Each structure stands twice: as C-alpha cells, then as structure tokens.
Design a protein around this ligand. Structure first.
Ligand SMILES: [Mg+2]
Ligand SMILES: [Mg+2]
Lengths: 275, 275
C-alpha cells in the first residue's frame, strides 16, 4: 500500500530518493523502453513472457540491459519482498541513459517501480466500453519527443484506428478482437510477437474450441460482428459495447467475451499453480 | 567551458545536483518537448523565433509552460550570466512532469541546460557530406517510448526519406534543399512553421534574387539538381556532396550553397546588431 522502495540500476532506493540526473536521454529525447505487469499471490504473472518482451524491446533500440534475465528476475522478487506486497503493478524502465554529450548512449539506466494493483484491474464489467474509430493519418519535428497520448476523450474512453479508410489498426494500448455471428474470433496479426495477454487469450479461445483468425480486419467487419473486446495487461479481457454509432448486442458483454474472461482468469490460476 | 549551473523550474541548480524524480513522465513514457539554439556574443540567436516554436511545441502536447515568454527569456539570460559564457548551446526541455499516478500530467517540469558551443557548429566544410535515401516505411507497440534515432550509419552520416517510393521526405533533424541548374532552389513546405534556420536561409536566398519553390520533391529531382544542402541550428547551411550513388558536382560545396552560407552568417550578424 505504502510503497517504500524502487530499484535503480540494481540498488534498492527509498521512493523519496529515486531520481535521475537530467543528462539521462529519456529526459532529453524520450529515448527509452518499458514494460508493465501485475503480481498476484507474491508472483509476477507470466513473468518469463514479460521479461522476454523487455529484452526484445531493448534490442529494437540497441540498448543493452545491464543484467541478464535471471538477475532481473531476482531483483523484481527482492523488490516485492522489500515492499512487503503480494499484489502489485510492476513497471520496468530502461532509459537511453546518462550521456556525456547529450546524444550518445553509453550506459542505459534501469528502473524497477512498484504500485498498488490497479483498482480497475480486471474489473470485467458487464457494461461494455464505448470507443471511436479514428484515421491512422507534428509531421515529424525533432522538438516533440512524445505513444501519441493526446486524444481529447471525444465521448469515448478509447479508440481504434482506420488506415487508408479501409483497415482497422490497433492502438498501442490494447489488442482488438471481433466475435462473428458464427463464433469465429478475429484479431490482427501485426502485434503477434508483442501481446502477452493477447497470446494467453488466443490460447484459451482455441482450447475452448473457437477458431481464431489472425489477419487484417476490414472496417466493414465492424458492421457484421456480434461482439468486440480489448485485451491488455490491466484490462484482462474487456467488453466493448459501442464503436462510434454501433452498439454491440445491447451494449453489455457478449457470450464469448464473457467465457474468455473466465478462461483468462483460469490461465492466471494455472500460471500461479506452477509458482 | 566549465558549465556550473542548469535551471530547473526557475531555480538555478549546480549541474551536479540537477535531477528529476523517476515519476517524471518523460522518464516513464518519453512524453516531452524540447528546443535548442546557440548563443553568440552573449545573446541567444533568433531567440523570439525559438521561444515561439517552444510554446507551440508545448501546445501540440497540451502542456502548459509554467512561465510566460518574457519570464523564460529572463531565465535564459540569467543562466548565461551565472555560467559566465558568451558562446553556448542552450537546450530547453519541458517534460510531461511529475505524476501521482504514473500517467496523468499535472505539472510539466521545465529544464534549461547549457553547453559549450558545438565544436562543429557552422563548420561550413568545402567537402559535402554523404547521405543515403531510405524508405519512409516496432509497428506501434506501447513498450518503445522512443525521433527514431537508430540508423546504423551505413557508410553515411545522415539520410533523407522516400515515401511511396516517389516523394522525398525530410528527417526530423534537418531541412533539405536542392539547387537546380537554373539556380531555382527547391525545398519541402511540410515543416514551414517549424524550421528556424530554414526561414532565415529562405529569406536570404530570396533577397539575393533566387527563386525558392516550396513544394513536394520527387525522387527523380535528385538526378536533375546541381546542388543539395541541409539547414539546421547546428549545421547552419551544410553542403551535401553525395546521395546514395549520386555525386553532386565534384562532391565539394556548390556555388549557390556557398553564397547561402555567407548570407546566413550575414543574417546572424544582422540579428546580433539589433541586440
Ligand atoms: Mg523511457
Ligand atoms: Mg522530454
């Protein structure tokens, strides 16, 4: 509840002293990567899958994480014990690091931060969320270091993109799924390698005997689906009740979406049992 | 030379103590804006044009700068005097700021940092730089907070983009110009509002009696130009001697590019005279 400590570069630091010098490249240029996952019953969920994503994110930016995976795993568990929590949100950050010339990475900085479990985590509400579609369309100016994060609500809480006015494109925040009248589930394949919750839910759906097609989604498919939902670390499986002017069902969670919520909780229990 | 102080949120801080808490959104998500300009003879160049850009960058991200322009101007001049320098590089940073929930901006942090004048600033070498073309083409994953900054050299020091395999698109670092056999100068208009050096050089070229067309540039135009150059804060006017397998002239600075270098220095002197 009270979080006492974070970790910077392997050292446990009181939250009140956790600071970086302003030469850090994430401060100066926004150069950095992150990951985020929950812990329950004293164990980070699907931890190996998250750590694998973190090492891959780092590689995409040519940043070397200063510890190997087993060492990072150890640091995370140590931090949970130092903060005395069994339920938490954990954020990993790897910055571009301190640079003598304000541009050259010479040593990334590694942060492990810890939070309460998000109050809304896996809310699993019966009432679906309302989102908009938006064109995928600053025209590349060096002065703006900042994922877009500038929506302005627009009676909605979230959105999905439309590209070339014909293809659905997922935001960075969540993976997007449709359930068709025939119980075919459809999702993009573009973030196949990157979605952790996405894979657990696809696996569960397949085990339940649903077909899951992974392909580009045409805008017109939104008019043909019975259900729509999001997956992410914090949401779990989250019903979407309305897109623009389209209500799905009566706006409440659909049959397959609900079953996938239960099966996701099942995948969480099964993981926890191996721990 | 020795830089003694930076400025954080209006307070002059010894460099060794200039730090931010890790809850800063630029650290966590890369959310932030910046500007950068030189000072000569104790005056930041074209300062009003830079400050105007900084306020506009901030508006694009819905961040409010905590001081008005006259106050920020005062802080910059004070910092120059505290560091006792007449020549400098000045970097402004406005982060997303400290956030109680690791996501909501509630108070951007403002940094003013100071450097030596870059050794290479306005080198104005006779030998032009060598660059490549590259497709404008991470498919939008939340985990990577980071302007691209991941080129891998590729016998070059810089690049320009090609979009739809037909249109030249400038990187974020520099504005791109061609000089045609008839002494027509051609540059994009896409960053009309954002390029500070770009405007000084366009103005100078027009005053010299050159026509400057501001429009999209077709890839094939690279095969028709006599000269090519970059403008930016640090480069001034910089000759490009080779693009991919195309040498421009004999690789050394062209006639109009050289004249534009002199005229840019003239615009700098003229500014300094008003100060
Ligand atoms: Mg970062
Ligand atoms: Mg920033």
């Amino acid at each position: 509840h009270m979080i006492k400590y974070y970790n910077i570069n392997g050292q446990q630091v009181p939250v009140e002293n956790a600071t970086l010098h302003v030469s850090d490249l994430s401060i100066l240029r926004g150069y950095g990567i992150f990951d985020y996952f929950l812990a329950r019953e004293g164990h980070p969920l699907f931890l190996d899958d998250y750590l694998n994503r973190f090492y891959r994110s780092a590689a995409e930016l040519y940043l070397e994480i200063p510890f190997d995976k087993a060492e990072l795993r150890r640091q995370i568990y140590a931090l949970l014990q130092a903060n005395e929590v069994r339920e938490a949100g954990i954020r990993l950050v790897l910055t571009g690091g301190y640079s003598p010339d304000g541009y050259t990475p010479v040593n990334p900085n590694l942060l492990i931060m810890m939070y309460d479990l998000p109050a809304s985590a896996w809310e699993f509400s019966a009432q679906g969320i309302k989102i908009i579609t938006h064109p995928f369309q600053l025209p590349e100016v060096k002065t703006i270091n900042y994922m877009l994060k500038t929506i302005k609500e627009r009676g909605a809480t979230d959105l999905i993109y439309v590209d070339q006015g014909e293809w659905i494109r997922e935001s960075a925040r969540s993976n997007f799924f449709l359930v068709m009248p025939d119980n075919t589930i459809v999702t993009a394949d573009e973030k196949i390698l990157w979605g952790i919750t996405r894979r657990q839910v696809i696996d569960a759906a397949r085990e339940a005997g649903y077909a899951v097609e992974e392909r580009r989604i045409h805008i017109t498919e939104l008019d043909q689906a019975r259900e729509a939902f999001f997956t992410s670390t914090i949401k779990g499986v989250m019903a979407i009740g309305q897109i623009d002017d389209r209500v799905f069902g009566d706006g409440t969670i659909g049959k397959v979406t609900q079953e996938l919520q239960d099966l996701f909780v099942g995948k969480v229990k099964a993981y926890l049992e191996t721990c």
